[PDB]
């Protein structure tokens, strides 16, 4: 049946077979272990679908395709079921994949500005959109006489105009539309964050854990969109070609080019399936870091030395922050956890971290009257004369709230006795306003000592 022969060289097929087997043995294992691991252990519901659609594609489509579309172009060896089935399955699984990707972008965006049911809607809608493949594809005998058994081939059973509509809509619905929508959400999400980073930078010393996580989420989701554009554009271009050249432009050269482009287009297609477990690992590590950062902020407040040292050892960011810009060391200083202040300083917590209101840990230790925390913060080189947005120094707070011992150690660590806030009030002024005579006296003698120095 010479008319139906492809004439791709043997090596070409052997090379694609080597590549297909590579993608299959690694991709199946990869996507299998991804599901198996979620079964064992919100975002996970999404990564399950993606892992499942790819596993279904690599397990059922790729072996069938390697046989009847790479090696043996005729006849079709899987019946009108296998024909309509292969195409239905593929359309379903890509649709499922594409819609999940839109969900992740939507979910990320909403975070930056029930689920188990939502997943099932995605899959069922994937079955719906894929049904037109059950009516367009089928077996036909294109052999010379019109009855030769070796000319039985799986191929469109409708006219070109009909096939143009399904394929153009398929190109729209499964590829262009959802990937554009994701690109738009990806870009807005990114933009919204980038101003958060500037605003945080303007005030804080450290931007929050929630931002650092969503920031890294934008980059991965961007990579996945770029990944599909590359892996899916050739494929769709090849299927438009099939229904955009009529019959009277199809030269023997253009016929040969198509079956090579088919090997290449469908190599790249299966590559998206085999890369998915990378996205899974990136997303999961991004999520695990956030939870550890979150768990470490609870532990620092609650004063749980054990949980802290487990989280720090297992890689938790010592200098993570909340929306306020509160680090673990801020929380430990504030809650009066001397032991936790010391473990956080050992593991390199920033001693001069500023929150939104420009409060260092020393500010919070000097406000709440923890002499031993003040002493340890200062031992590790805290800013004695660090001033908040109001121009309040730690010595202001110590003097205002009557922490004489803190005043004395602050003074002897080089505190400016004469520091003034926005409203020009000195520690001494604050000491008197509230009625701390012993402090006010210590301060005024310090003030006097400095006068003497000027006049000699």
């Amino acid at each position: 049946n010479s008319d139906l022969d492809v004439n791709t060289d043997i090596y070409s097929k052997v090379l694609v077979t080597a590549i297909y087997l590579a993608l299959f043995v690694v991709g199946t294992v990869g996507n299998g272990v991804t599901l198996f691991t979620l079964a064992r252990k919100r975002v996970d519901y999404y990564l399950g679908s993606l892992a499942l659609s790819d596993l279904l594609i690599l397990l059922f489509a790729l072996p069938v395709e390697l046989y009847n579309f790479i090696w043996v172009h005729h006849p079709w060896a899987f019946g009108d079921a296998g024909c309509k089935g292969y195409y239905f399955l593929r359309d379903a699984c890509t649709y499922a994949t594409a819609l999940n990707v839109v969900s992740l972008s939507v979910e990320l965006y909403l975070a930056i500005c029930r689920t188990k049911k939502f997943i099932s809607a995605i899959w069922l809608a994937s079955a719906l959109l894929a049904i037109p493949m059950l009516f367009t594809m089928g077996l036909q005998n294109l052999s010379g006489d019109g009855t030769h058994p070796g000319g039985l081939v799986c191929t469109p059973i409708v006219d070109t105009a009909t096939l143009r509509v399904v394929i153009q809509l398929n190109t729209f619905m499964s590829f262009l539309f959802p990937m554009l929508v994701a690109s738009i959400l990806n870009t807005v999400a990114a933009r919204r964050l980038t101003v958060m980073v500037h605003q945080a930078a303007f005030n804080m010393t450290i931007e929050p854990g929630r931002v650092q996580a969503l920031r890294r989420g934008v980059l991965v989701l961007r990579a996945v969109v770029i990944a599909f554009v590359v892996c899916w554009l050739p494929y769709h271009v090849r299927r438009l070609m099939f229904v955009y050249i009529s019959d009277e432009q199809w030269t023997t050269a253009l016929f040969d080019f198509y079956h090579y482009f088919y090997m290449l287009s469908n190599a790249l297609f299966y590559v998206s399936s085999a890369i998915n477990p990378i996205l899974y690992n990136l997303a999961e590590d991004l999520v695990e870091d956030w939870e550890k950062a979150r768990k470490l902020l609870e532990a620092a407040r609650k004063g749980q030395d054990d949980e802290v040292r487990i989280l720090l050892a297992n890689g938790a960011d010592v200098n993570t922050a909340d929306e306020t810009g509160f680090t673990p060391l801020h929380l430990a200083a504030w809650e009066g956890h001397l032991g936790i202040v010391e473990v956080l300083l050992k593991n390199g917590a920033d001693v001069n971290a500023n929150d939104e209101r420009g409060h260092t840990p020393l500010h919070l230790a000097a406000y709440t009257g923890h002499l031993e925390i003040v002493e340890v913060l200062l031992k590790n080189g805290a800013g004695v004369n660090a001033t908040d947005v109001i121009g309040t120094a730690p010595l202001h707070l110590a003097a205002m709230w009557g922490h004489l011992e803190i005043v004395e150690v602050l003074l002897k660590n080089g505190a400016d006795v004469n520091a003034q806030d926005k409203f020009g009030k000195t520690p001494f002024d604050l000491a008197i306003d509230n009625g701390n005579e012993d402090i006010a006296e210590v301060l005024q003698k310090a003030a006097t000592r400095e006068l003497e120095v000027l006049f000699q």
Binding site: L4, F69, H73, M137, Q140, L142, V153, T155, P156, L163, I167, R239, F242, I245, S246, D247, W250, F255, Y258, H259, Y262
Partner: peptide, 5 residues
């Protein structure tokens, strides 16, 4: 014209 899509 090809027959495989």
């Amino acid at each position: 014209r090809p027959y495989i899509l």
